DNA sequence: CCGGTGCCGAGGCCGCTCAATTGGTCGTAGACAGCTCTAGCACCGCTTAAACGCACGTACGCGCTGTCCCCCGCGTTTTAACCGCCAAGGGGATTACTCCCTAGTCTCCAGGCACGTGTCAGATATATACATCCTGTGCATGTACTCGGGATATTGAT
């Protein structure tokens, strides 16, 4: 599943919840650097 | 004719999205702690010898203390050149970029002068007798301050 949101505040609350429950949490927002983006995007193919 | 109302244009709100800043971690290497004599050496203990520092009177001037008179300060007035503010033209110091080059590193080399010791001798402290140059005192007089009156500037207003 790919969850899409808009508000960073919302995203943060969602993060808090995804840390409360253990479903893993991988994000790539606009505040993330381009290198971190590229990294996560390489991971999300060829990683499960 | 004027007025309601749609259409368009602008102002206001909110929010990311992205690019620039600054404290935290890794890491390695030359330099602050710290014996180790040593080493000879200043510092301390232990003596006296001489003189300067200190205190007591005591003589003797140089600071505080009281009285008249004008000269400088206080206080007012008007007015004017200057201070302070504002505004516009333009030059030049600023900022950023590429290119050149000599500072910086370190390496190697080596001969000149800092630096210490050893030797010895003459320049300098020191004591005493000699004596004369400088210093306090006293006193004549003249260069210079002061007052008064006539030159030559030296500013301001027509």
Curated annotation (Swiss-Prot):
Segments passing through the bilayer: none
Expression by tissue: According to PubMed:10574462, widely expressed. According to PubMed:16298340, specifically expressed in brain, liver and pancreas.
Places the protein is found: Cytoplasm; Nucleus; Cytoplasm, Cytoskeleton, Spindle; Chromosome
Coiled-coil regions listed: none
Bridged cysteine pairs (disulfide): none
Family under the similarity heading: Belongs to the SNF2/RAD54 helicase family.
Function comment: ATPase component of the chromatin remodeling INO80 complex which is involved in transcriptional regulation, DNA replication and DNA repair. Binds DNA. As part of the INO80 complex, remodels chromatin by shifting nucleosomes. Regulates transcription upon recruitment by YY1 to YY1-activated genes, where it acts as an essential coactivator. Involved in UV-damage excision DNA repair. The contribution to DNA double-strand break repair appears to be largely indirect through transcriptional regulation. Involved in DNA replication.
Domain note: The DBINO region is involved in binding to DNA.
Subunit structure, interactors included: Component of the chromatin remodeling INO80 complex; three different complex modules assemble on different domains of INO80. Interacts with DDB1. Interacts with transcriptional repressor protein YY1; the interaction recruits the INO80 complex to YY1 target genes. Interacts with YY1AP1. Interacts with tubulin alpha.
Note, other: Although the ATP-dependent helicase activity displayed by the INO80 complex requires INO80 ATPase activity, it is likely that the helicase function is carried out by the other components of the complex, RUVBL1 and RUVBL2, and not by INO80 itself.
Protein's UniProt name: Chromatin-remodeling ATPase INO80
Full protein stretch here: 1120 to 1167 of 1556
């Amino acid at each position: 599943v790919l969850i899409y949101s808009q508000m960073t505040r919302m995203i943060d609350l969602l993060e808090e919840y995804m840390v409360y429950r253990k479903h893993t949490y991988m994000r790539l927002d606009g505040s993330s650097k381009i290198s971190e983006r590229r990294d996560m995007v390489a991971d999300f193919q060829n990683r499960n």
